[PDB]
Amino acid sequence: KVLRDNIQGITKPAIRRLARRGGVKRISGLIYEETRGVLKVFLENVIRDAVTYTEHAKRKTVTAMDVVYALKRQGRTLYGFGG
Amino acid sequence: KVLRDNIQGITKPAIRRLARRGGVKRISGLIYEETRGVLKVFLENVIRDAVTYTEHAKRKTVTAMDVVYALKRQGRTLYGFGG
Amino acid sequence: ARAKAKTRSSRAGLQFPVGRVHRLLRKGNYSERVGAGAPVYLAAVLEYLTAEILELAGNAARDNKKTRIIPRHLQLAIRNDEELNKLLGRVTIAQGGVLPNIQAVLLPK
Amino acid sequence: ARAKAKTRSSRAGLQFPVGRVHRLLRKGNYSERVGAGAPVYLAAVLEYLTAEILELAGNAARDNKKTRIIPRHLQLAIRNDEELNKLLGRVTIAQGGVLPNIQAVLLPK
Amino acid sequence: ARAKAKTRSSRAGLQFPVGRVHRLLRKGNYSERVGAGAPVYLAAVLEYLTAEILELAGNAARDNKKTRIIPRHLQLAIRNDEELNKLLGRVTIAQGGVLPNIQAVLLPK
Amino acid sequence: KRSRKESYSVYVYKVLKQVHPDTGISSKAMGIMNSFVNDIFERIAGEASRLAHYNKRSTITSREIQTAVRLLLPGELAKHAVSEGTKAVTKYTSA
Amino acid sequence: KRSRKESYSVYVYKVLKQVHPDTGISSKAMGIMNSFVNDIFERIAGEASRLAHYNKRSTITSREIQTAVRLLLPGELAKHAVSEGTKAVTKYTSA
Amino acid sequence: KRSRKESYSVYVYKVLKQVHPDTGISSKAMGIMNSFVNDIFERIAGEASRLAHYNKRSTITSREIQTAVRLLLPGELAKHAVSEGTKAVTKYTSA
Amino acid sequence: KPHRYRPGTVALREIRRYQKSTELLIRKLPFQRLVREIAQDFKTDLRFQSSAVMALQEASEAYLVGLFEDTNLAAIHAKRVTIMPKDIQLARRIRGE
Amino acid sequence: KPHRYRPGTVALREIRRYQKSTELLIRKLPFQRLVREIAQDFKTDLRFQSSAVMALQEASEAYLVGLFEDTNLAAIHAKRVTIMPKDIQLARRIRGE
DNA sequence: TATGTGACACGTGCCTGGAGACTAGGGAGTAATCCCCTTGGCGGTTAAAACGCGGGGGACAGCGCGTACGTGCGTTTAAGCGG
DNA sequence: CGCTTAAACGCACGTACGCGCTGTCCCCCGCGTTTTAACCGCCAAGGGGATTACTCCCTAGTCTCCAGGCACGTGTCACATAT
């Protein structure tokens, strides 16, 4: 239930996979934690938005339609979830 | 009637002034024409839409309020000319 | 006693539904009246765009010898058109991937 | 037999015109119906925002010993607040100038 | 008694006269009956090809800074589209002239 | 007893069959196309709404939609859309 | 007193202003279009007639002329002509 | 004279004298603040309209105004805007 | 001797693979667990559509991968092939994050 | 001896001065000439409000200046102080342009 | 190249949303005007641009170097799938 | 919860790569001078933006009725997987 450091649940080889899909050749060891913090900031922005939608929606559970509204609020529109 | 060359009217010392406002300490000689081209692209992108407003406003006089509309269309909203 | 039912989409000669787009625009609260040719024109524009991206997806599928459109083919079609890339520079696609693209300095020798 | 025509801004203890804002919302076509407390809440939020930005502008004008607020003071106020700058990063002020900013690598030894 | 006469050109919604083309095919001795949609198809493909060659001609005229198209524009347009050129290799245009074309060894040095 | 939900499925599937009779579809690609068609729909509709406000018109006409196409759609897609849509305006005008 | 003579001028003019409102036309270029539409007309017409003879079909339908335009016109122009004619004949089928 | 043109000058001046009786205002800064308040107003109105259609709400009320101002305003601005708005809503509730 | 590729060859092969491939680069269960971890901080006992977690997913690595070609452009601008987090900082700050 | 400042000193003083200043750095009437020249490329012989001209001048100068801070960030990120147009192209590519 | 399969795709009920008939009236098209705003142009002037010399500061190549990821192989466990 | 491997970790050895330093060359700002056209500023002119009126085109809305597109069920072959 109570969760502690799942930011490191995103593994370093997963980050290497992400860099290789971006075509990055060589990755420093300092990269992974800084990118974890960056994605943490990004996720907490979008989940703050999606949450705010959700308690406004009078639903207790998050729906993806709130999620896509949150992403188009941030100028980061994503296609393919009934939007 | 027609005009042929006014892109050079944005002179090199004007670019130098803007770069010092931009905090640039040292400016190459290759900078000025490329900035003229980039500025040309930005101005034509905004003025095409400003035109499109102006005939859509059925006017032949270009107004600043349409300039505001065009600039805020491209995420470049300017304060000081609305209304 | 009454005229036989004839769709306004066929009156435009168009496929996207004129009545549905008109209803969406009326209930979408953009103006309290709307010109009759406006949703017809709108459905025509979206039909043109849907058509052209559908041929582009068809060519991407045929080049990769798959009979059915895949969001990978949508990604490859949408990113390789600079017109459509500038149309959708901020748009992401689910399970789309990226262009196969490498920098020259990343290649050996 | 009408009572004295009292103002809703004073009813909410506010400066911004509640009636004008409600009129703009009713004619800005955002919904056909507007809840009564909504323009009040909006006008209060706007009053708080305008109050804090004008307070910052007055502080900046006082810092430059200037008794009448300046768009340069507006720029210096709006860009030196983190919440305001992240609120209004893509918004530009006319004749604002820029923030005084020189990189340390630009600075000499 | 009778409805208003609405043209088959309007029924297709295309500019080329359907009735004239049907009349010509009736009096041109190609079959003893003709399908109704075939001259519609004819008018459609003719208007498509005239539209594209008129695009080419208008583009050439704007390249030559002329408002009205001339046979030189027609020549330059019809010779630089390979499908049109090999469509009309043996077809000659009045006052068209020739393509600007010089062999490499004709050039000095 | 379940409620009906709106989709663009039959229309996109038909226009796929005219543009490519032999080419199939995956379902989540249709979801992406649904998102695209909806997205451009409120882009053009919001442009039409604000352009109607700017000229103080309470009626949005095909002129406004065409202006919105010229604004949001760049380059060639705008002019081909204008050509086919004005064509469609004449087509409905005949009806 | 004169005799009425057919021309394809006015339809070329509607098409021209549909595709280029800014562009004029010279009358002998109009005559060249007249020669064009006539020449392609009996090219396709003889193609349809001889195809109708090949399958001994005494009636020429849209399938026949589609076959003929696929024969003479090459590829890109052929397939987009197919698309134009196909949507035209479907909207006539609805008409 | 001419027709009346809307402005927010008097309210800006009143709020200015609430926060700074001592200082003055330039009318160009007044115009900038008019642009500011119009921009924020249309922003909040836009997302309120969005949220009204998201919950399919025919009436726009203050709760999604709260939602929108919490959405746009970062942190401290958002909570104290909620505080000021809630205070004024309660005072108008008490007339 | 056993076979051993020189540095960059396996990197090139996996770059080409993941450019061609579209499937997820993140293990799904710790991702969902992290989403619940972050969301619980803002509102308690938040339940998730799995599709919502997935949409959060493709939004996340889309943002990351875009930041990654930004980082790569910064690195080739700096005449390098090894990226450092200051490149990511530069990309975010020029984007304005 | 006629005094000569060491290079970049006057450049930094200009940086301080023009960061302090708020006015437009573009000549107004050549800017209007270029604006009308590009206007007739879309529609010939229009009229202009001068307010539109200063609005375009403000927006153009602001966009250029922000582009130069991005260029300066790229150049110092490449451990240089002299900018080249490659830096500007890099910044435009980061901005998504 | 061999093989299952479920996802795509297609027949079917329906009701519901969209079209047909008709109207009120009102926003919208149009005429007029005028005046104010915009364009056109003319003289003085100087700052602003431009141009030349110069000379230091910076870009960048060369070269090495030590290290820090790349690559490779063994393990754990933890992600992943079914129910 | 119960298997069930895939990959995450982890170590280990090797290379190549950021980077540190310097040589070197050249580029561009500092400064002074020349030109020049920008700009004030002034005035003439006219043009169309905007305003008022007037009448009307459409269209939003209401009632009727019906067919279209989506839910529903199903079957089936393009593709996933294996080799």
Numbering used by the authors:
A (entry chain B), B (entry chain F): 20 to 102
C (entry chain G), D (entry chain C), E (entry chain Q): 10 to 118
F (entry chain H), G (entry chain R), H (entry chain D): 30 to 124
I (entry chain A), J (entry chain E): 37 to 133
Show me the paper's own sentences about this structure.
In our structures, we observe a compact stacking of nucleosomes 1 and 3 that is similar to type I interactions with a contact formed between H2A–H2B dimers. The observed stacking does not allow for interactions between the H4 N-terminal tail of one nucleosome with the acidic patch of a stacked nucleosome and thus leaves the H4 tail free to engage in other interactions. H1 is absent from the stacked nucleosomes of the 4×177 array, but is present on nucleosome 1 in the 4×187 and 4×197 arrays, and is present on both stacked nucleosomes in the 4×207 array. Particularly high Δβ values are found for entry DNA at nucleosome 3, except for the 4×207 array, which is the only array where H1 is observed on nucleosome 3.
Here, we report cryo-EM structures of human H1-containing tetranucleosome arrays with four physiologically relevant NRLs.
